[PDB]
Design a protein around this ligand. Structure first.
Ligand code: HEM
Ligand code: HEM
Ligand SMILES: CNCc1cccc(-c2cncc(CCc3cc(C)cc(N)n3)c2)c1
Ligand SMILES: CNCc1cccc(-c2cncc(CCc3cc(C)cc(N)n3)c2)c1
Ligand SMILES: C[C@H](O)[C@H](O)[C@H]1CNc2nc(N)[nH]c(=O)c2N1
Ligand SMILES: C[C@H](O)[C@H](O)[C@H]1CNc2nc(N)[nH]c(=O)c2N1
Ligand SMILES: [Zn+2]
Lengths: 413, 411
């Protein structure tokens, strides 16, 4: 724990000094003997709860310039009594909004954080049933989509109590396409969603069995068995994919949804755990064009595209894969822009992230960042983040991973 | 303590036990990960040296299936006596070769390690002068180049003694191009070599002030002041860069050297330190086409190529940078292949490394790997290493960074 750590940008020689890392609480997974930097995935008693609450409230009252005020001390007193009496406590609306914005600010794997202070927070802590969850999520989807002019948002459902009454969205993302495993081993739709699609089918979903079927919401309230709901199609904004020069690209039959919305993570604020907290922003082009379309384990279209460009596919050293990859990503950006749906290219997004990061070092004393996730999955070193040294550490409030609900849920019947 | 790594493309999970043998530290802690830091953070004494020797001799004699044998114990005793008596010791040829091959095997930032056992080791421990060093290095360069059919090699000069008599190659690579300032204010040649080029000039180099001037070697023997030598031009194989479809590409006047040879690292074996140990393999295309040619702080040619292709350079979202990048890298590979000079593309190299990883996990119980360096600087996720979890840890024998000699050297 040196008081100071420096990071260097090897393109510009800009050096920054991190002090924020001293406020780090959680573990990284690394030790002095091993680095787990590329590892994807490396109730609560009142004893451990009041320090977490106090730490959070101190940060909140500092940020509003009321540290040590009567208001601050009264709040600490109030939360303390509430914890020792009820074993938990409730956040004020202001503290909830602060908490969610800062969990985003602290998200070291997110390149989009220049936007963190612009987040619409929907307080759904009065929700009690799956039907109510469905209503709240429809409203979030409509607000966030904004007819293509996307707005960042998060909807926060009631916190965990004894761990037996959890709210969960079983979908990993609010909008996703179904995947179907055929008897011959082939896959229709999104191969990554085969298992979840099967769960949905088992729960009674009638699958149209096409290549781009929007999955139903599977929603769990208060620890009850989850229930199926179909998002109104008119709320699901989609973009057919075409290419500005290649007129055959449309006949690939590709489209994607406009709203990226993560729904399987846990929001921790002041020791409290919000197990259902779907959040959404707008896409960076490579997410679709590189990963969704071109991962071997996803739609995997590099082959067909390269064929239609008539590239030399007999030797990898022709770089036919790289050539097709670029065209596909051009087409995604082109399509979204043409239909006036918010999207950002990986050049713009990484450039903005560097400006954000430098701003954060100056005003906050640091910006935790995961290089392995921040660097885009194509053209890495012609973006500025590639050459930027980053320190990764964990601040709270935070977004955390949690087990998949189908592995832990106790079925009521 | 027994760690698992998962491939998220194939769902294959491997179990690493080799990390438990890790000696050196990572830079990371439980509170902060320094995985993206390029460089995280004086003789050895008698007491420090003998356990290092034993650890090494133990793994050597294990490797030849004679662990705990008479010859094993005999060698341990002999080295022990030699250290006690002379405060250092000398490696047997067999041990030197083993150690060098395993330093490569342990290089966590190297994607090319499937080749680790096929390394030609040149023992230059009898070298005493800078002229001797020059001769050894010329022979290395000729052997490794092999008229375009490259062969991996390392040349190992005398080990550090009291630290006052270090052998050093002052160049960071055996072959690189000069960089010059401008009254124009711009930069001619390789911008990353302006400082070194000035030192060469200050030491008396006659610079032709061109865009691709092979730098002279600056060689330091036995702690003496470094001396200048020019590598015979006919030993430095270069490749003119042309494109298989774009006839205008040759007009850029681009070329690059065929031999990638690192000369500024320190080789540690059994606690002994070899401060001058140039090694060489063959290029992966992206090294030249992505980094050397398109880094903004390097030859920075993206804009020029983009213009020749007549792409829309008004908006970043047209991905004109990305399109030019691919074409530049197509040309590099095409040029090397056409001139019959060994090169590997990033798809081929990363596929090899995945096979090497699986081999190492199966027969060794792990493979230390730095994902940040192993994933190529373009088209990351369409190479298999992107989806491969890797554990990074430090085994010896190893190649280590050391301070640049011009900051340490007392003249
Ligand atoms: C507003 C525009 C945004 C952009 C352009 C953006 C960009 C990205 C991208 C490209 C990723 C990587 C996704 C992946 O590879 O699976 C990511 C990850 C992440 N983002 Fe952002 N994001 C945005 C908004 C948000 C918001 C509103 C939140 C929360 C309130 C957020 C929190 C996170 C978190 C927690 C991750 C890690 C995801 C994981 O571990 O699976 N982001 N972001
Ligand atoms: C024979 C084919 C080889 C290939 C294709 C290959 C590939 C690579 C590449 C692409 C890098 C990254 C270099 C950079 O970005 O600056 C690298 C680094 C490295 N390689 Fe290999 N290499 C080969 C041979 C060797 C040999 C023969 C040795 C040692 C005897 C070696 C040891 C290392 C080390 C220590 C690094 C890290 C160097 C640093 O930290 O700057 N490699 N290799
Ligand atoms: C570790 N990868 C998790 C994963 C795999 C496959 C697909 C996804 C995924 C599916 N649909 C939407 C997303 C959106 C991710 C995201 C979230 C947010 C808030 C913003 C943004 N630009 N991107 C991811 C995630
Ligand atoms: C951290 N980057 C150090 C650096 C910066 C700029 C240029 C270089 C460089 C220059 N010339 C040759 C190299 C060769 C690296 C290498 C070594 C070996 C043994 C094999 C290989 N394929 N590639 C690197 C290295
Ligand atoms: C800051 C970051 O660590 C730095 O730019 C690294 C990234 N990955 C790299 N990977 C390789 N192979 N070579 C490099 O020089 C670098 N540079
Ligand atoms: C094993 C490795 O950590 C894994 O493939 C990571 C690499 N970097 C990533 N980066 C982003 N943004 N998203 C990802 O899913 C991944 N996957
Ligand atoms: Zn680490």
């Amino acid at each position: 724990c040196p008081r100071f750590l420096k990071v260097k940008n090897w393109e510009t020689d800009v050096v920054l000094t991190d002090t924020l890392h001293l406020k780090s609480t959680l573990e990284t997974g690394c030790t002095e003997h091993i680095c787990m930097g590329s590892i994807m995935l490396p109730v609560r008693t009142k004893d451990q709860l009041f320090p977490l609450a106090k730490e959070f409230l101190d940060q909140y009252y500092s940020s509003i310039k009321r540290f040590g005020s009567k208001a601050h001390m009264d709040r600490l007193e109030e939360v303390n009594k509430e914890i020792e009496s009820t074993s938990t406590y409730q956040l004020k609306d202001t503290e909830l909004i602060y908490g969610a914005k800062h969990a985003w600010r602290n998200a070291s794997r997110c390149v989009g954080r220049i936007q963190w202070s612009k987040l619409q927070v929907f307080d759904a802590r009065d929700c009690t049933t799956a039907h109510g969850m469905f209503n709240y999520i429809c409203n979030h989807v409509k607000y966030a989509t904004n007819k293509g002019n996307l707005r960042s948002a998060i909807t926060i459902f009631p916190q965990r109590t004894d761990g037996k009454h959890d709210f969960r969205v079983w979908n990993s993302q609010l909008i996703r396409y179904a995947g179907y495993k055929q008897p011959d081993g082939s896959t229709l739709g999104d191969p990554a969603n085969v298992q979840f699609t099967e769960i949905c089918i088992q729960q009674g979903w009638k699958a149209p069995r096409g290549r781009f079927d929007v999955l139903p919401l599977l929603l769990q309230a208060n620890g009850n068995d989850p229930e199926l709901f179909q998002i109104p199609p008119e709320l699901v904004l989609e973009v057919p994919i075409r290419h500005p020069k290649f007129d055959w690209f449309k006949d690939l039959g590709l489209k994607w949804y406009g709203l990226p919305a993560v729904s399987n993570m846990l929001l921790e604020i002041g020791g409290l755990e919000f197990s259902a907290c779907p959040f959404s922003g707008w896409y960076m082009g490579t997410e679709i064009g590189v990963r969704d379309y071109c991962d071997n384990s996803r739609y995997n279209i590099l082959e067909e595209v390269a064929k239609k460009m008539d590239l030399d596919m007999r030797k990898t050293s022709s770089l036919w894969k790289d050539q097709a990859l670029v065209e596909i990503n051009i087409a995604v950006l082109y399509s979204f822009q043409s239909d006036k749906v918010t999207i950002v290219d990986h050049h713009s997004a990484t450039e903005s992230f560097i400006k954000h990061m430098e701003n954060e070092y100056r005003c906050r004393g640091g910006c935790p960042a995961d290089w392995v996730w921040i660097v885009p999955p194509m053209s890495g070193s012609i973006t500025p983040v590639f050459h930027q040294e980053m320190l990764n550490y964990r601040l709270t409030p935070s977004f955390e991973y949690q087990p998949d609900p189908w592995n832990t849920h106790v079925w009521k019947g």
